[PDB]
Design a protein around this ligand. Structure first.
Ligand SMILES: Cc1cc(C(=O)O)ccc1-c1ccc(C[C@@H]2NC(=O)[C@]3(Cc4ccccc4)CCCN(C3)C(=O)/C=C/C(=O)NCC[C@@H](C(=O)NCCOCCN)NC(=O)Cc3ccccc3CNC2=O)cc1
Length: 163
């Protein structure tokens, strides 16, 4: 299971680092997409993009590096790739899962849960977990609102692979 990181700021002020373990032992294709989008090694990826939809007591969503609003993103494999499996569940805060627009629409957008989102089980592919920096996730959450609109611009200023 690779480890990756996101460094995040709010209106240009650093919030800190989120470290994520990707469950490549369960969803290796989904993990590999996210890993490569963190490193940028395919020529596109998360660096410079935002947490565009942040809803307290729900989740923090990011990864739309094409349209910055929840309508875009793409995978390293092409526009979409299928739901690899639904083996892992949305068991609590800190779960990392793929955003989608219905079956088999995984691209780049992802979310970090701030509550157990069990109503998403079987609908979104869970593929990793926060290992370090859950406090940074809670900081991101604090910059959200009910509609999802953020009170500050939340930017992934750097990201990459740790192991
Ligand atoms: C890469 C790709 C390729 C192809 C292809 O090549 O063909 C086609 C499509 C994609 C693709 C496109 C978009 C996404 C992200 C997805 N974009 C959206 O859907 C839209 C609509 C859209 C769909 C397709 C294309 C353009 C626009 C754009 C952004 C804002 N839109 C809609 C939303 O906000 C959606 C919210 C929503 O569905 N509301 C339901 C309730 C809510 C919940 O559980 N609420 C309960 C809260 O309780 C808390 C306790 N009280 N569920 C949720 O939020 C569900 C959810 C969960 C986690 C993360 C994201 C989402 C919503 N998905 C989005 O954001 C992803 C992939």
């Amino acid at each position: 299971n690779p480890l990756v990181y996101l460094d995040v700021d709010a209106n240009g002020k650093p919030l800190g680092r989120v470290v994520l373990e990707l469950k490549a032992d369960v969803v290796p294709k989904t993990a590999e997409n996210f890993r490569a989008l963190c490193t940028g090694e395919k020529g596109f990826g998360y660096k410079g993009s935002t947490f565009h939809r942040v809803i307290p007591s729900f989740m923090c969503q990011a990864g739309d590096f094409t349209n910055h609003n929840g309508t875009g993103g793409k995978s390293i494999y092409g526009s979409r790739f299928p739901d690899e499996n639904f083996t892992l569940k949305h068991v609590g805060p800190g779960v990392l899962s793929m955003a989608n627009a219905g079956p088999n629409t995984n691209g780049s957008q992802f979310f970090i849960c701030t509550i157990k989102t069990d109503w998403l089980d079987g609908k979104h592919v869970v593929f990793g977990h926060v290992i370090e920096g859950m406090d940074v996730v809670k900081k991101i959450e604090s910059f959200g609102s009910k509609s999802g609109r953020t009170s500050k611009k939340i930017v992934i200023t750097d990201c990459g692979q740790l192991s």
